[PDB]
């Protein structure tokens, strides 16, 4: 997250850290949203790879066990059928991860609220992106969970020539693009929390940014539109 601030410890209890086993220890690679004691929602490209994945709930500082964290492995990976590992701009960048054991829910570990199927946010809706990705475009990964105000940029605008043009599909969400704040390498799969009538809900899954950099004017961070996959999500959980 570029242009953000260290989030208040566990203020986004559904935010999780997707880590893969590297050597003897673990390494953070993506973010995710806990949606069931045993299910995590993240980006497809975070899990194409044949890696040993672990998920951390109740996390904040990736380099210290503050005692609120829970470490569980990923038992099964379910990438959306239409996902094309070679064309992120094609969309369908979402995947569900059934956990080895179910996490114990508490004040640090909560499920994320998903929008109603098909919900479309009005332009410039208040949202916050959260993650452990880079904090300075072309810099270092964050030790502590970061957050940044990232209001939405409706399709009309986002798909305009000056913005993302044809790169963005209706099944996506754009936020930010003001040049100062945006997601960055390491935030993928993470959530985009949007406030709608007092209620927060994960409307997007962090997908991509421009080759030119993270915080690039008129190239807002792009997320998979959660409200566009509710049916798929429920089906995957029900039949697994």
């Amino acid at each position: 997250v570029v242009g953000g601030t260290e989030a208040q410890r566990n203020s986004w209890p559904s935010q999780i850290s997707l880590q893969y086993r590297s050597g003897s220890s673990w390494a953070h690679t993506c973010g995710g949203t806990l949606i069931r004691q045993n299910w995590v929602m993240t980006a497809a490209h975070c899990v194409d790879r044949e890696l040993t994945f672990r998920v951390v709930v109740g996390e904040h500082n990736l380099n210290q066990n503050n005692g609120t964290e829970q470490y569980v492995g990923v038992q099964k990976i379910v990438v959306h059928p239409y996902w094309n590992t070679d064309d992120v701009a094609a969309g369908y960048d979402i995947a569900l991860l059934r956990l080895a054991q179910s996490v114990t829910l508490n004040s640090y570990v909560q499920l994320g609220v998903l929008p109603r199927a098909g919900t479309i946010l009005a332009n410039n809706s208040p949202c916050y992106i959260t993650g452990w990705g880079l904090t300075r475009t072309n810099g270092q990964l964050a030790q502590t969970l970061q957050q940044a105000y990232l209001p939405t940029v409706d399709y009309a605008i986002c798909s305009s020539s000056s913005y993302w043009g044809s790169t963005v599909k209706n099944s996506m969400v754009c936020a930010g693009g003001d040049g100062v704040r945006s997601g960055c390498q390491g935030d993928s799969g993470g959530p985009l929390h949007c406030l709608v009538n007092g209620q927060y809900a994960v409307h997007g899954v962090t997908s991509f940014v421009s080759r030119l950099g993270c915080n690039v004017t008129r190239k807002p961070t792009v997320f998979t539109r959660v409200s566009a996959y509710i049916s798929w999500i429920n089906n995957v959980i029900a039949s697994n």
């Binding site: 993506c30 993240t42 980006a43 497809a44 490209h45 975070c46 899990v47 992120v88 701009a89 960048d93 990705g133 790169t167 997601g183 960055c184 390498q185 390491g186 935030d187 993928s188 799969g189 962090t206 997908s207 991509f208 940014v209 421009s210 080759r211 993270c214 961070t221 792009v222």
Partner: peptide, 7 residues
């Protein structure tokens, strides 16, 4: 586009 994960 480039994914925020380093893909």
């Amino acid at each position: 586009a480039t994914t925020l994960x380093x893909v």
